[PDB]
Design a protein around this ligand. Sequence first.
Ligand SMILES: O=P(O)(O)OC[C@@H](O)[C@@H](O)[C@H](O)[C@@H](O)CO
Ligand SMILES: O=P(O)(O)OC[C@@H](O)[C@@H](O)[C@H](O)[C@@H](O)CO
Lengths: 556, 556
Amino acid sequence: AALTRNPQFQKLQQWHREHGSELNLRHLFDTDKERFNHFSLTLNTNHGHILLDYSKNLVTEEVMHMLLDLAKSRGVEAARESMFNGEKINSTEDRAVLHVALRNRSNTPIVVDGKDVMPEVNKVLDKMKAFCQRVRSGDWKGYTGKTITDVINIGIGGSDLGPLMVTEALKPYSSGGPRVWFVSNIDGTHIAKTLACLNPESSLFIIASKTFTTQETITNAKTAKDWFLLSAKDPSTVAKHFVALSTNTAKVKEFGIDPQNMFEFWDWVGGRYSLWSAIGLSIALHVGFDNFEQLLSGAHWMDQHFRTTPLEKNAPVLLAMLGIWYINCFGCETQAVLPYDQYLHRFAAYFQQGDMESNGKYITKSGARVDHQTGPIVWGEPGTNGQHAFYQLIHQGTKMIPCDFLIPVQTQHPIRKGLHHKILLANFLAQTEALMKGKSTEEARKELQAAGKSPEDLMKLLPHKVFEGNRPTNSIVFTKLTPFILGALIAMYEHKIFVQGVVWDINSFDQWGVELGKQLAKKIEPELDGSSPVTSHDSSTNGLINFIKQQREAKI
Amino acid sequence: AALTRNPQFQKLQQWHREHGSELNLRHLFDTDKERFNHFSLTLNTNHGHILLDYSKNLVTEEVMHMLLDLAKSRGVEAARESMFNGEKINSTEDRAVLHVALRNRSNTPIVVDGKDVMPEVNKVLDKMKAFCQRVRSGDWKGYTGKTITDVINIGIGGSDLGPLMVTEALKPYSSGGPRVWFVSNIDGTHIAKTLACLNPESSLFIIASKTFTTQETITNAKTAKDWFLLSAKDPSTVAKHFVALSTNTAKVKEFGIDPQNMFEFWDWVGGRYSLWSAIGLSIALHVGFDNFEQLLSGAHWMDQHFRTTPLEKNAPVLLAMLGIWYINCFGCETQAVLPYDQYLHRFAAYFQQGDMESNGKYITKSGARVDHQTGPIVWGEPGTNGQHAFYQLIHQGTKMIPCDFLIPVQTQHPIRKGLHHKILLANFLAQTEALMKGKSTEEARKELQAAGKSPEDLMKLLPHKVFEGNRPTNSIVFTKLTPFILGALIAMYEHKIFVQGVVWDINSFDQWGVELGKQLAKKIEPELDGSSPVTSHDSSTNGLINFIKQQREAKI
Ligand SMILES: O=P(O)(O)OC[C@@H](O)[C@@H](O)[C@H](O)[C@@H](O)CO
Ligand SMILES: O=P(O)(O)OC[C@@H](O)[C@@H](O)[C@H](O)[C@@H](O)CO
């Protein structure tokens, strides 16, 4: 309700109704040689540069002004401070939101109802490093005196995506580290296929679960233990092959893991923002603690940029408001994330959760139902592959789709004297250029006539060759995808999401939308047993269950 | 535009504007005990059953009737026959569309240009089987007399995603076959990390490219060949380690591969519909030819169901029209594909290309520009993971998102005596029930009161715990995910895509939208070499390029 009442918002929307359709990227660049200079920012982190070019967006200096005025009147700055200061901004759960403390390497005090949290944060960090050291050095032996060769993280959602995405992204920095595996789905196939290729002797399992009660995780963990025990037959050895990352000690101990091997994080760490805490143990074990600290450092650098930079040149804010523009004014349902980097193949999926689970809300902080759009659908696949799969729709479809193109200037594998990367870069550049420029009917007609096409054949194919263009994109280029830079990029989007949540006046840090499904699932599980028909639900659920019971023992 | 002029379409549209928002799933089920029976389709393939339950959709008998009348008035059946009969329906390229011929196990003649295509189709299948047997049995030897332990498919888009998705989906049926790898991205990382795990002596590369001129594929191919010859040495050994799947004989020879080592397909085989042709060699090598023929047989079965079934009971037609309903009447931008199966982890991605590249068009067969929506943005991740990642938005966001839930009754890994699959099934069922049913304010309040919440805690939380529900879903349940069933499922969606294209009167089989990007990339490629700044493009393209040249030398 708040947003739609805001005068800055109304002014912005009225302007859009009057001039929105007028805006044409090709025309804007053709009439302003300083567009790139005026609509981009270069960030020097001292550990590489980050160029955020947002010039190929449907905005003018006037549009940007109104967007910033809106961010201001919506209290983005005061909201940011409240988060960094440990205030309980996660209202529905009455909790603080402090993933920024997890990477607060300046160690500036951050008190939550009485005490500074940093001491506990750094205590867990030290414990992690000391542990990674023992594991990666062979010091930590299995139940038969052998060294650890494989680490298996068992968790789902926030306790899975972050570590997986990061270890994939930083694979080049895993030299000398154990092989890391990730089991998340309850689908038996996941754990089964993973355990098939593992020696219980040199295998270390990490049970990652904030609540340590999640059905998928606990079930997978128990199955892993059975698998392990079948070989090491002796319960007392699980303490050598099972560690836990949780906030609850009782359940961990109950599972059979000693509190000494429990790396804890806190309630003001949201799952989808937990890879920076003990949840990132698998990351540290894979790339070493030095690199993990660089990861955290990169995020801290971005945290500072977000906190001290004027809105007009604040990356997270600029990305967020541009998003608001397309979402609330142009009505675009989605946001595409297209990294031209094979190592970042799980990047889009990570923010699919980070963004959608955070802002996929419809009730404001005041308890009022929104009367405007909130979080968008995030999606995408790494660069050069997408061009041969779905760019067709982005270029000539009937949907407006804001796209974020990302790529590192320097590749981790400069094979063929850099030939591959040069081509990758050319495509990265050419695609955003094409989306902006397009190709007019006249340009396409000349091409066809030069191809000796008959008037009949020229007319029949002509329109299909036209690219209307005027499709907006953001180009984010960084020196190299290192642990530090990656950390800065993730934090950057974390804050983009934070800013949009504030503007929409929703709680980006809770997730009550998962309860109903969990409840109905618990009531169905017992009903699946046996061959008796179920009639307790709607005819559809009843029909599906009965189909399942009937086909349960059908021989193919 | 044909669709907007259609009277059945206008009637549908008018009805929606007048009663659309009145449809409430919970109400529909509560007042119609026959809903499931009236809106579900059960297919017995004699090799497993497939249940398409579309009752949880915002439709009534009357709506389904209007939808079917539209499919009829748009000439869906006549278009289908034209495709199956080899007519050149790919109008912009003047080519036939015959992926159906590739799996025509009945061998009924399909004539193109006065000649039956089946003889050539089967000749290639026999060649494929013969080659597979040699490699699989160990008969085929490397340049050092060693058998083949690894098969590397080098290709992109249509020559990649299909075999990749299917080999992943059918892992259970790959016992014996050599390890299969897929290289696609030009990003040097992709081929570098793959080659690092191979021995040139026992590696067999498959260059998959219809044209055999695609830059990414040819460049990757050349890099692999150099890598190989690095150890081998003489150009003569290449014939034992490289084969090609293409239509370009001249180029294949030019590359260094001699015919007979080239498995061909034809121009009427669209890349995104080519896994059923020679492009599926990697699938055959991985799971054996018997399983591959099962895959083809499954699709053929579906082809037959599509061709002989009355529209009202035609699976792909119903799927198609329900989509039209949500796209052109409700205005939904996306389509979620959520398979509750880890093996199908790339299923959604496969149809992201198959659907979006096919129907992401804006020009009709008559040359008119569409004045209505076309293809939707396809996306998703396997279940139950999604439930912890983005379902928050599907349940409580501000977007209507049609969802296709898929799951096999029987699992390939019934570990823990079926415990994992029992839970997976329970969630599959509960999620759609939840999306449909929701949870009212009063229902939520009663729960909060029972939970012992205080008046002030109950009041701040209440709103956030309400699920408005009324979110549509399709539940597709099949006995087991076998080669045959997977084939039927893929074909089912291919035809869904076909039907929608017909209704929108667009050409679902060309892809002119990729041309602009490719040509602009060829222009930038040589401009990256120099150290001199570039000024020949828009200021953004210029700025990005210059940043790259500056940061290229940056030491980190
Ligand atoms: O097992 P855990 O650690 O309690 O996580 C259980 C998952 O449902 C949860 O992490 C979910 O991804 C979100 O809340 C993250 O913000
Ligand atoms: O190298 P190929 O086989 O010519 O494929 C080149 C790819 O651009 C192409 O397959 C693309 O995915 C689509 O047209 C498929 O319909």
